[PDB]
Enzyme design. Structure first.
Site: not given
Ligand SMILES: Cc1ncn(-c2nc3c(C(=O)N[C@@H](c4ccc(OC(F)(F)F)cc4)C(C)(C)O)cnn3cc2C)n1
Ligand SMILES: [Mg+2]
Ligand SMILES: [Zn+2]
Ligand SMILES: Cc1ncn(-c2nc3c(C(=O)N[C@@H](c4ccc(OC(F)(F)F)cc4)C(C)(C)O)cnn3cc2C)n1
Ligand SMILES: [Mg+2]
Ligand SMILES: [Mg+2]
Ligand SMILES: [Zn+2]
Lengths: 313, 338
Positions: A67, A71, A107-108, A205
């Site tokens: 982050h 990013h 946004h972050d 994102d």
């Molecule tokens: C249950 C769970 N939570 C996060 N997880 C993972 N996240 C990621 C991401 C990613 O970029 N995650 C962002 C994010 C950002 C917006 C978001 O909301 C929406 F609406 F866009 F889907 C969901 C995840 C992050 C790091 C903030 O969780 C990349 N690889 N990865 C692997 C896993 C296991 N799994």
């Molecule tokens: Mg965020």
């Molecule tokens: Zn982000």
């Protein structure tokens, strides 16, 4: 302001990886993208003020593994790609698309590599508050010549778009997104504008999942580095971290595949339903997920560890 | 001369002075520092009375022991400390199972000397590798089978025929040949292929009961005892089985690397990119090690604790199998391996 073609001949393609651009060229690329979308001339943005704004936003990111500014840059680049490839002007107002891009940059802001639980939408409210503080820093208000009406619109859009980056928000609106995708977008429906902006923001994102294997693998590394650092901090405080934050319990293949199947893929599926030209994005996410399944077996240690030791038993 | 002088001017230590638990199945001979092992060999021969029984010249025996020690190379597993640990186990079988009720004194003496010599000049590679690499040992022994084991025996012969090292040079013509025949047969029994050929005969003997007047039973028992000594690291605690597994797999994977460099396809257990240690280790323990100690238990009720220890160690391997699945990131902090 460098013309976009001079950055890279493939800069406006979905195949381009914005992390390939060196970090010292990203602020100029931000300016080049805003110029190519015509927002500088459209909104009569003062170029010195915009330069100062962009550098302040860049400075407002810390350096955790994922982050960080790169990013935010990559997310903003994807927003630009959606503009260039999906013809967003047929669906959204110019001020809405402008708000989306600026929201992507911000946004972050001030992310610490920790999530909301470690601290509704705690971090996302903070990111928005940080964006506001930048705008109200002397010399950085890119909207200070906006009308009172347009200024409040821009602030309201930025708040709603940044708040849409919380997974909890996305899950709440998911049925509304599906409904819109089903019935078809209606440019005269203000709810549809609001829902589409949320979907687009989440699509930006998670856009690291829409590139090649190299990107999804490398970003996974950064993501898990961040998650496990948080878990280590939680353990040091005496608390019990979630399995996905605990480096001694987390099983990456399972966590990654679930994230891709149940969070990432449905976003790009909805995007495909609303924009046929977004089909290649969904296909690339599904392909990357298949690749994760294929390499899952490599998390079982064959031979001895690199250590050459069985002390770990 | 220096190692000789130390072995010769330290007198034959009584076994109790090495360790109060030295004659117990719980003792781990790898705990003894390497510089004390030659004296321990002499102490064990003295405690089994073979020095007085066969009127062995002590200077000749010291020279012999040091030559045997020198004839081991330093691969991870098949080194002098393996030979010493195998010989120590032979001594334990003598002390705990009362082998004098089953075997002749010359047979037990041959077994112990065979234990010392049975992997002489091992290079950390198996019989298959000799053929594949077209080594000098393959050229000499490949048409006969048991390539390495024939070499180990030939090395033992060369030591005996080195001036000052023939511990059997005062034996009668009859006893000399007997000793050479026993050593050959016992060393050849350390080939897994040989063990698998005689396995049905071993089962038969275990079931019908040992017969001290049956010369085939003597021969089969010596083979079983030798293999029981060769695998005796599996009869100790978890620490030993785990540490020996480490040495074993290092050796196996080093061989596989050589085979790959030669253009050949190594067996999965020699290939560090395919070998899954839990599966390999558990199969080895269930299908090779445990049946040997089961047979030993069937023939000697007092060997029951050995079988139980091997079964217990196997259970421990099953319990820790899950640790070969990477949780979190690797120690590297990198996903480059995908
Ligand atoms: C249950 C769970 N939570 C996060 N997880 C993972 N996240 C990621 C991401 C990613 O970029 N995650 C962002 C994010 C950002 C917006 C978001 O909301 C929406 F609406 F866009 F889907 C969901 C995840 C992050 C790091 C903030 O969780 C990349 N690889 N990865 C692997 C896993 C296991 N799994
Ligand atoms: Mg965020
Ligand atoms: Zn982000
Ligand atoms: C199919 C196969 N072959 C060897 N395997 C393993 N061996 C070992 C040993 C061991 O001590 N191996 C020796 C040995 C020596 C005489 C022998 O014959 C007899 F008759 F005693 F059983 C069998 C094995 C060695 C290294 C020479 O293979 C320790 N852990 N381990 C794990 C495995 C997977 N598996
Ligand atoms: Mg051998
Ligand atoms: Mg019976
Ligand atoms: Zn051996």
């Amino acid at each position: 302001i460098q013309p976009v073609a001079a950055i890279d001949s493939n800069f406006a393609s979905f195949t381009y990886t914005p992390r390939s651009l060196p970090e010292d060229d990203t602020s100029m690329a931000i300016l080049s993208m805003l110029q190519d979308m015509n927002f500088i001339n459209n909104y009569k943005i003062d170029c010195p003020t915009l330069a100062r704004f962009c550098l302040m936003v860049k400075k407002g990111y810390r350096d955790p593994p994922y982050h960080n500014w790169m990013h935010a840059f990559s997310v903003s680049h994807f927003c630009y790609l959606l503009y260039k490839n999906l013809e967003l002007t047929n669906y959204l107002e110019d001020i809405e698309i402008f708000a989306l891009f600026i929201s992507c940059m911000c946004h972050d802001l001030d992310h610490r590599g920790t999530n909301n639980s470690f601290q509704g939408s705690v971090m996302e409210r903070h990111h928005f508050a940080q964006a506001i503080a930048i705008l109200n820093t002397h010399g950085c208000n890119i909207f200070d010549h906006f009308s009172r009406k347009d200024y409040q619109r821009m602030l309201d859009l930025m708040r709603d778009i940044i708040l849409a980056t919380d997974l909890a928000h996305h899950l709440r609106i998911f049925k509304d997104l599906q409904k819109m995708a089903e019935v078809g977008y209606d440019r005269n429906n203000k709810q549809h504008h609001r829902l589409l902006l949320c979907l687009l923001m989440t699509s930006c994102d998670l856009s690291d999942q829409t590139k090649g294997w190299k990107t999804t693998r490398k970003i996974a590394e950064l993501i898990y580095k961040e998650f496990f650092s948080q878990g280590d901090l939680e353990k040091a405080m005496g608390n019990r971290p979630m399995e996905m934050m605990d480096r001694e319990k987390a099983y990456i293949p399972e966590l990654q595949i679930s994230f891709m199947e149940h969070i990432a893929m449905p976003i790009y599926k909805l995007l495909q339903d609303l924009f046929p030209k977004a089909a290649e994005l969904y296909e690339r996410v599904a392909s990357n997920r298949e690749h994760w399944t294929k390499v899952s077996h490599k998390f079982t240690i064959r031979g001895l560890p690199s250590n050459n030791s069985l002390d770990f038993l």
